[PDB]
């Protein structure tokens, strides 16, 4: 169960089939695998990972019960394909088991008001600058990891960014402040890791291990955010901070919440230890799971809409 709120399960090394009107999993560990304790009801969703297959009859039964289905990648990220969630309105009232969502209405209810979009961007930036502190300071596991974070410089940069963010009149100023904070955090981590001078090459052209690690962590985080928006039911195009033209804006906006706080340390740690790709991927997944990122992304996304409707 990736998230307690979402009620989302992950399946691997298993064949899903039906025997006498009931969906059955066949996997090593026989009739003791804990896949038999998965409530099949309106309040469940299934994600199938590595080494898995699903029969047509099984998905007929799942549709009869009202369970969404999706095919994810190794470990839970990225998302390849899945079902779609319908909207809930006074009209458009079909008879089906699937439970519809309501957040698209509330989201669209303010996305057309520029100032409300500004408020939302402020909330996103505030969440990111908040989580950066916890990740970079409180983590005892990270402290034992080896990369040494100087409290003074990080506090100075976080306070400066907070002051700058509170005083951004238009979107472009907010983007400039974001870039400044990102560059400063990059520099601080580079100094902490002793890696030396580092940059964020365009096109992913950077040949240094740090570049590859950063790209891979980015890819994983984007996958996770895609899962988040799909679970909630909002579309990808309806960006909040990015420009209205840039496709997939909302995925990157939500992904940024955890990227600079989770991916950044791990890439430098791996480069210092000079580990291979598989171990780095496993480490990133483990850290994401422990930090319980997906829950935080979902909670923030609901909170924005709640505040927008309350202030209405």
């Amino acid at each position: 169960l990736h998230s307690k709120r979402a009620n989302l399960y992950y399946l691997q090394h298993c064949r899903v089939l039906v025997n006498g009107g009931r969906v059955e999993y066949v996997t090593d560990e026989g009739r003791h695998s804990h896949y038999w304790n998965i409530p099949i009801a309106n309040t469940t969703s299934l994600l199938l990972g590595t080494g898995t297959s699903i029969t047509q009859a099984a998905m007929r039964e799942l549709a009869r019960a009202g369970v969404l289905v999706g095919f994810c990648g190794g470990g839970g990220t990225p998302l390849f394909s899945a079902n779609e969630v319908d909207v809930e309105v006074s009209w458009l009232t079909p008879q089906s088991e699937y439970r519809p969502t309501e957040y698209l209405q509330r989201w669209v209810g303010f996305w057309f008001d520029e100032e409300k979009r500004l408020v939302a961007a402020r909330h996103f930036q505030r969440a990111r600058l908040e989580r950066i502190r916890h990740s970079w300071l409180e983590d005892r596991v990270l402290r034992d990891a080896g990369f040494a974070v100087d409290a003074t410089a990080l506090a100075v940069a976080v306070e400066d960014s907070a002051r700058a963010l509170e005083q951004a009149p238009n979107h472009e100023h907010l983007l400039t402040e974001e870039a400044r904070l990102s560059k400063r955090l990059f520099k601080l981590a580079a100094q902490a890791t002793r890696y030396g001078e580092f940059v964020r090459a365009k096109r992913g052209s950077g040949g240094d291990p740090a570049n590859r690690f950063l790209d891979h962590g980015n890819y994983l985080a984007y996958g996770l955010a895609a899962t988040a928006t799909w679970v909630l039911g909002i579309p990808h195009g309806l960006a909040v901070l990015h420009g209205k033209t840039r496709r997939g804006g909302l995925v990157f906006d939500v992904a940024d919440l955890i990227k600079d706080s989770l991916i950044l340390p791990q890439a430098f740690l791996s480069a210092m230890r000079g580990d291979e790709e598989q171990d780095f991927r496993q480490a990133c997944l483990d850290n994401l799971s422990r930090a319980q990122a997906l829950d935080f992304m979902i909670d923030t996304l609901k909170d924005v809409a709640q505040r927008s409707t309350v202030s209405a």
């Binding site: 006498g20 009107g21 009931r22 066949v26 009869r64 019960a65």
Partner: protein, 1076 residues
């Protein structure tokens, strides 16, 4: 036009095609060509490639018709190297990767499992009552319990659930293991009180699933059967069930009070019982959407009846197993049943419930595997070999049509007909057609049922010979069905111990003659290692009588419907000579056909005199059954289009139908075509009306006069027809009659009178009152000695018995006669030079007519089939006359019994099935025999005014009438005077002493007082032929069967008779003759 040609040949074929093609196109690849060619070039290329092609040739031509479009023109040679579009596979392999055996399509297996398991855990709970325990411990005289234990169990369950509550309420309550307490027994509405409380099945008393479980709980020993029969309340079933329906015997108030007492609590105390019940309730709660299915499940016959079958089988198996201390509380005081021998307590109640539930759970997952693991007949060359005789080509045509229609029949159903006229050997046609339908990879299974009361062994072996199947592939179910009341007395005696589930599935008399594999039975565990049931189930092909399968739906008590029902589910069905049934037994046949269609079988009637009304009714019943089945099997949503077919010796057709009207239209068209084709044949028989002369109605003198006239008829008709060889003339006769007593009286009279001048007569009495082994021997001899052909005078005269008879004779003319009974109508492939037929019904007249000159062509144009103007019953002044057998009834009287007026004179010159297979318009029921029969069939089968019943057959599937045994009583099967089984048994210590003993409840009691000897007198130039030595025949049969002589006489020497106070008289040549 420009085209693309690709080759996929191999070996030498490759070089040839390369040579042929390289003349027309430039080589674009090792196996590809492409060039612009004209149409003529393409046609000649196709011709050339066709001419020299081999087995390994596969060439495809594609046309680039225009823009973004190209089509496949043709494929020369093997078509398995390409698909429809002309693509080719990329890879190949043998290891299965689809692995499609893991997933089955029993879409309701889980619901059945849950309902059964819950029903099992509660079914025998009523055995905790103090009265039951006292009876268990009581050794003295037994008193029948005032209430059946199943009714007590139902009342306890109703009290627990709590009236008026929704399902979730009691489900949750039961599932909560912590909850315990006897505070819910205050609602036990006892039925001993002065005011009778409302029935548990009423609308306000139980929720749907509660009633579904309760029905299985209460109906696990016998179906409910009250006295009400109003169709209005039938459609409201199971509501009107009340304590009386379930055999609530009348007793005194003390016993009634004593039944409703539970001094020792309930099984709820046991920890294992409670845990298992909680688990089952939790599972039944978690299943998606089961709660909202309650009402639909309650009124569904397939689910409820499969569940009841499973429960009955599991209960029967476990009740026989010995005690086991591993299950339940080791020190629980209550018990379920004793031992049958030692009369001591054997099992604990909770242990018994737990064991039955476990077994039901185990079995419910085995049924889906039965079709896959059971034996089958496959790769049988006899059914595949072509036939060279031109008379047997229509069989090949029908066999080809079977393949033509096989695919869609596997998915939608099947309902076949077979109208080939007699003498065409329909048996082989039926075998081949049914085999063709089955998938060649796996094999075939089916069963053949005859409309005969008793099936003699020689008939089964004849079936083997005609099919050409070894003794290792065809089981035979000898004997006939048993009586209902015989099992009662032992059951009441066995009810002392409460082991009513231990009764044998089949009767003791029946034996299955089979010697094939018997060790790898998937159901071996429950049915018994060598009981008759397992042998019946193993055999790929079965031959039996319809009376042996009818218990599938007509059974009212015990578990007699388990084996035939399993047979129906796992195989297919063939009905033979259905119209041989009496009119009032057709409801039962309709119910059997409906259930056969309800469980996935495929029916195929077979006869040559099927009136339209019968066929229409049966098709409607089969379709009604098939519709329900498709809900619970196969891909959901597909339509209901049965795959009908018609088959005879002229042509063949097949079409898909889904409504009664379209089927009726197509059938009418086919029968009209058949009549048109049939009319052109040349006749082989010329009937005639003969006027009997009667002075007095006394049976003896009447028989004397009849024999006197018959002798003259014999002389004249033998003069007319005869076969000569070296100056000697012989002939084969047939004297059919209606009833056995007049038959034997006529036989005695003719024996006394003697043959006419210049003629010698051989007589061979043959009816159904002989001992079964003797009858089989007689039938064997007759079948051997009555095969005819063309220009076979020398061959026939070369036969041993004929040569012996003739050698010791001084006359020049001899007469051989078969004074048969109606038994000669069915299954006898004989041939007679002539016949004299007593009139009872049109079917009899046609069927007997088909015998004459069955195998010998040509015809002298002389009359060779007399007919009595009036039947014997008329001569005795009996009204109605055409009855037993016959159709005349008080509701359908006939003005004049004389045959001169009841039969069209045109039909005399040509007698066939034309008058029967079509319904004339207008109908004249008071003048014409066929009119009367068609009227009765139309009235009963399909019309809504069935005589004397007013209960339309469609009630069986228009109302939930199968939940209660009501229809089985208002329209019984083979009803009438009860019959008893007798036998000639040698004395235990003196084999030379034969005793006339009656069959008592599992013991034979001597009844030598009832028997008496009768003497015979003979005349001139008269002798018998075809007779049998009873003692020698019995010894021979025992020797062949490697059995004790007494046991063999017990098994095979059975004979049935109607009760008579004064007994009978016996003679080895006449059988049993009633005495007064």
């Amino acid at each position: 036009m420009n085209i693309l040609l690709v080759s996929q040949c191999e070996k030498r074929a490759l070089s040839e095609t390369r040579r042929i093609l390289d003349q027309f196109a430039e080589r674009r690849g090792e196996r590809t060509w492409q060039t612009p060619i004209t149409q003529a070039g393409l046609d000649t290329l196709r011709r050339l490639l066709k001419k020299s092609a081999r087995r390994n040739t596969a060439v495809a031509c594609h046309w680039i018709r225009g823009r973004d479009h190209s089509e496949l023109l043709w494929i020369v040679g093997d078509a398995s190297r390409f698909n429809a579009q002309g693509a080719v596979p990329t890879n190949r392999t043998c290891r299965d990767i689809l692995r499609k055996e893991d997933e089955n399509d029993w879409h309701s297996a889980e619901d059945i499992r849950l309902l059964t398991v819950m029903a099992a855990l509660f079914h025998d709970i009523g055995k905790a009552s103090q009265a039951f325990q006292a009876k268990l411990r009581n050794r003295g005289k037994p008193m029948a319990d005032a209430y059946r234990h199943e009714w007590v169990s139902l009342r306890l369950f109703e009290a627990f659930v709590g009236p008026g509550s929704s399902d979730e309420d009691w489900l949750r309550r039961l599932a909560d293991k912590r909850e315990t307490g006897d505070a819910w027994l205050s609602q036990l509405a006892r039925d001993d009180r002065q005011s009778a409380p409302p029935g548990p099945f009423q609308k306000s008393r139980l929720p749907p699933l509660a009633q579904a479980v309760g029905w299985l709980i209460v109906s696990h020993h016998r179906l409910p059967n009250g006295d009400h029969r109003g169709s209005a309340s039938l459609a409201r079933l199971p509501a009107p069930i009340q304590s009386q329906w379930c055999g609530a015997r009348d007793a005194d108030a003390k016993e009634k009070a004593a039944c409703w007492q539970f001094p020792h609590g309930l099984p709820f105390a046991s920890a294992h019982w409670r845990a298992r019940t909680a688990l089952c309730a939790q599972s039944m709660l978690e299943r998606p959407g089961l709660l909202a299915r309650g009402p639909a499940l309650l009124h569904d016959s397939y689910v409820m009846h499969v569940s009841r079958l499973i429960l009955m089988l599991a209960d029967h198996h476990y009740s026989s197993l010995p005690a086991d201390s591993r299950l339940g509380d080791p020190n629980f005081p209550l018990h379920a049943n004793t031992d049958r021998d030692s009369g001591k307590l054997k099992q604990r109640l909770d242990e018994h419930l737990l064991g039955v539930a476990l077994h039901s759970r185990k079995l419910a997952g085995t049924l889906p595997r039965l079709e896959r693991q059971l034996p089958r007949l496959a790769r049988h060359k006899g059914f595949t070999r072509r036939v060279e005789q031109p008379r047997f080509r229509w069989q090949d045509k029908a066999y080809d049509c079977a393949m033509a229609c096989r695919e869609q029949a596997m998915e939608h159903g099947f309902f076949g007909l077979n109208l080939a006229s007699t003498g065409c050997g329909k048996t082989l046609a039926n075998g081949r057609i049914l085999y063709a339908l089955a998938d060649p990879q796996r094999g075939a299974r089916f069963s053949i049922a005859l409309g005969l009361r008793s099936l003699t062994l020689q008939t089964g072996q004849a079936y083997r010979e005609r099919l050409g199947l070894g003794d290792d592939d065809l089981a035979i179910l000898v004997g006939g069905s048993a009586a209902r009341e015989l099992f009662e007395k032992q059951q009441e005696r066995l009810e002392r111990s409460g082991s009513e589930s231990a009764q044998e599935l089949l009767a003791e008399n029946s034996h299955v003659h089979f010697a094939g594999t018997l060790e790898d039975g998937p159901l071996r565990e429950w049915l018994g290692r060598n009981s008759a049931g397992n042998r019946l189930l193993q055999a790929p092909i079965l031959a039996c009588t319809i009376d042996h399968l009818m218990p599938a739906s007509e059974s009212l008590r015990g578990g007699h419907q388990i084996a035939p029902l399993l047979r129906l589910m796992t195989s297919d069905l063939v009905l033979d000579e259905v119209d041989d049934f009496d009119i009032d037994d057709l409801p039962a046949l309709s119910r059997l056909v409906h259930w056969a269609g309800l469980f996935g079988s495929r029916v195929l009637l077979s006869s040559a005199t099927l009136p339209p009304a019968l066929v229409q009714g049966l098709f409607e019943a089969y379709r009604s059954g098939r519709e329900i089945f498709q809900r619970h099997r196969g891909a959901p949503g597909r339509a209901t289009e049965i795959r009908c077919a018609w088959f005879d010796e002229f042509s063949s057709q097949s079409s898909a139908h889904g409504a009664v009207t379209s089927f009726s239209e197509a059938h009418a068209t086919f029968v009209a075509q058949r009549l048109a084709k049939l009319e052109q044949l040349p006749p082989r028989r010329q009937a005639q009306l003969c006027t009997v002369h009667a002075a007095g109605e006394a049976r003896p003198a009447l028989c004397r006069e009849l024999a006197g006239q018959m002798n003259t008829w014999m002389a004249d008709l033998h003069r007319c027809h005869h076969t000569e060889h070296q100056g000697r003339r012989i002939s084969f006769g047939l004297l059919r009659l209606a009833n056995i007593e007049p038959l034997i009286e006529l036989a005695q009279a003719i024996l006394a009178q003697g043959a006419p001048e210049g003629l010698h007569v051989h007589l061979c009495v043959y009816h159904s009152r002989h001992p079964l082994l003797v009858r089989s021997a007689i039938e064997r001899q007759l079948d051997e000695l009555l095969k005819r052909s063309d220009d076979d005078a020398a061959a026939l005269f070369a036969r041993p018995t004929l040569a012996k008879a003739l050698q010791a004779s001084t006359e020049r003319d001899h007469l051989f006669v078969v004074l048969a009974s109606p038994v000669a109508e069915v299954g006898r492939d004989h041939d007679y030079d002539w016949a004299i037929v007593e009139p009872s019904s049109m079917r009899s007249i046609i069927q007997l007519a088909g015998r004459i000159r069955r195998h010998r062509s040509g015809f002298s144009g002389e009359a060779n089939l007399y007919l009595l103007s009036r039947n014997i019953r008329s001569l005795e002044g009996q009204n109605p006359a055409f009855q037993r057998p016959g159709f005349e009834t008080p509701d359908f009287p006939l003005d004049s019994h004389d045959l001169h007026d009841l039969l069209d004179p045109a039909l005399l010159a040509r007698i066939d099935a034309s008058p029967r297979i079509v319904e004339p318009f207008p109908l004249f029921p008071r003048s014409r025999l066929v009119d009367l029969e068609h009227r009765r069939l139309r009235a009963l089968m399909l019309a809504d005014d069935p005589p004397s019943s007013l209960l339309g057959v469609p009630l069986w599937w228009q109302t939930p009438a199968s939940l209660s045994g009501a229809l089985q009583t208002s329209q019984p099967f083979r009803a009438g005077a009860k019959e008893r089984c007798y036998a000639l048994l040698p004395d235990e210590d003196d084999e030379e002493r034969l005793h006339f003993s009656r069959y008592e409840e599992g013991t034979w009691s001597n009844q030598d007082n009832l028997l008496r000897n009768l003497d015979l007198t003979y005349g001139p130039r008269i002798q018998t032929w075809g007779t049998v030595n009873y003692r020698e025949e019995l010894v021979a049969m025992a020797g062949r069967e490697d059995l004790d002589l007494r046991q063999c006489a017990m098994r095979y020497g059975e004979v049935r008779l109607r009760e008579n106070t004064q007994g009978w008289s016996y003679h080895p040549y006449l059988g049993f003759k009633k005495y007064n």
